[PDB]
Design a protein around this ligand. Structure first.
Ligand SMILES: COc1cc(-c2ccc(=O)[nH]n2)ccc1OC(F)F
Ligand SMILES: [Mg+2]
Ligand SMILES: [Zn+2]
Length: 321
C-alpha cells in the first residue's frame, strides 16, 4: 500500500493528480502526505530549517481540524488546492519571480485555507446568527476563522514549523498568508478579477516582471483563488466527483434551511435543482472568466488547463438537452 501511494505521488508536479486515490492510500492523510512531498520537492525543510517531525506533527494536527463529515470542504479539498497551487507556482512564466518566503506563504495558505469548515456558507452563518458570524461581524466569516485556526495550531506541542524563521520573516509570512486566505472569500472575486485583468493589460515581460508587494501579493491571491476554483479544469473523472461532493454539501445546507423555515439558498434545494445547469453557470460566470484571465497572464503556459475547462463545460452543457 505504501509503494502504491509512492507511485501516485510521482505525479505531484502534474495537473490531474489522483487526489482521491491518494486520500485512500494514505489512510485519509492526503493533506499531510501531499504537503510533505511538496516541501521535500521544493527543498523547503532545508531552506527554512523545518524539522521533519515538526512538519508532520503540524500537518496531521491541521488535517485533523478538517471535518470528516463535510463532503466538499474537507482535507481532500485542502490537499487538492495545495497541490494545484504548487503546480501554478511552477509555471514557466513565473520562474524566479517569487522568493522562497512567498512560495512558502502561498503553499501554507492553501493548506489552511478551509480548515474547520462546517459545510455551510458565510451567508448561512450570517442568516442563522451563528457564533462565527457574531464573532466576525459578518465579514469574511469563514475565511477569518480558517486563518485563526491555522495559525493557532502552530502553538501546539512540536507544531511550530516556522520556529527557525527570523521575526521579520514570520511577520511577513503572517501578513501574506492572511492576505491570501482572505482573498478566497467569493465576495472578493469580482474585485480580485478586475485587478488581475488590469495586471494582464499592463503586463511587462523579460518571464513576468513584478517589482512591488501589491503586484506580487495580488498574483499570489489570484493564484490560490484559481487553485480553489480549479475543479472544472481537471480531468472529468475528478471534476464529476467534486461536483457530486459540492452538491451533497449544498443539499445538506438546504435541508437545514428548510428545517428552520428559511428560504432555501440557490442550488441547495435537492427537490428543485439542476446540477448540470449549475456547473455550466459556474464555469460561464466565474471559473472561465478567472481562468481565461490567468491563462492570459501566463500565456501560453495554461493553455492545456483552459482547454480542459472548455471541454468540461461543453460536456456538462451536452447533458442538458
Ligand atoms: C465544483 O463546483 C463548485 C465548487 C465550489 C467551491 C470551490 C471551492 C471552495 O472552497 N468551495 N466551493 C462552489 C460551487 C461549485 O459548483 C457550482 F454549482 F456553483
Ligand atoms: Mg473557503
Ligand atoms: Zn476552498
Amino acid at each position: 500500500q505504501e509503494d502504491v501511494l509512492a507511485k501516485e505521488l510521482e505525479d505531484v508536479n502534474k495537473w490531474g493528480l489522483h487526489v482521491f486515490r491518494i486520500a485512500e492510500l494514505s489512510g485519509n492523510r492526503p493533506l499531510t502526505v501531499i504537503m510533505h512531498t511538496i516541501f521535500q520537492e521544493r527543498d523547503l525543510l532545508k531552506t527554512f530549517k523545518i524539522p521533519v517531525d515538526t512538519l508532520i506533527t503540524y500537518l496531521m494536527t491541521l488535517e485533523d481540524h478538517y471535518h470528516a463529515d463535510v463532503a466538499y470542504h474537507n482535507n481532500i479539498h485542502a490537499a487538492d488546492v495545495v497541490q494545484s497551487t504548487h503546480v501554478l507556482l511552477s509555471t514557466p512564466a513565473l520562474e524566479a519571480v517569487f522568493t522562497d518566503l512567498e512560495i512558502l506563504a502561498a503553499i501554507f495558505a492553501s493548506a489552511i485555507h478551509d480548515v474547520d469548515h462546517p459545510g455551510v456558507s458565510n451567508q448561512f452563518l450570517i442568516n442563522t446568527n451563528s457564533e462565527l458570524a457574531l464573532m466576525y461581524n459578518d465579514s469574511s466569516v469563514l475565511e477569518n476563522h480558517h486563518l485563526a485556526v491555522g495559525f493557532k495550531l502552530l502553538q501546539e506541542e512540536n507544531c511550530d514549523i516556522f520556529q527557525n524563521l527570523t521575526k521579520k520573516q514570520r511577520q511577513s509570512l503572517r501578513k501574506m498568508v492572511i492576505d491570501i486566505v482572505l482573498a478566497t472569500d467569493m465576495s472578493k472575486h469580482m474585485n480580485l478579477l478586475a485587478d488581475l485583468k488590469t495586471m494582464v493589460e499592463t503586463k511587462k515581460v523579460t518571464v513576468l516582471l513584478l517589482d512591488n508587494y501589491s503586484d506580487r501579493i495580488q498574483v499570489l491571491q489570484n493564484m490560490v483563488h484559481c487553485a480553489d476554483l480549479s475543479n472544472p479544469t481537471k480531468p472529468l473523472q475528478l471534476y464529476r466527483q467534486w461536483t457530486d461532493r459540492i452538491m451533497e454539501e449544498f443539499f445538506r445546507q438546504g435541508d437545514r434551511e428548510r428545517e428552520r423555515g428559511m428560504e432555501i439558498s440557490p442550488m441547495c434545494d435537492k427537490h428543485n435543482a439542476s446540477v448540470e445547469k449549475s456547473q455550466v453557470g459556474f464555469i460561464d460566470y466565474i471559473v472561465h472568466p478567472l481562468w481565461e484571465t490567468w491563462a492570459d497572464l501566463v500565456h501560453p503556459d495554461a493553455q492545456d488547463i483552459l482547454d480542459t475547462l472548455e471541454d468540461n463545460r461543453e460536456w456538462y452543457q451536452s447533458t442538458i438537452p
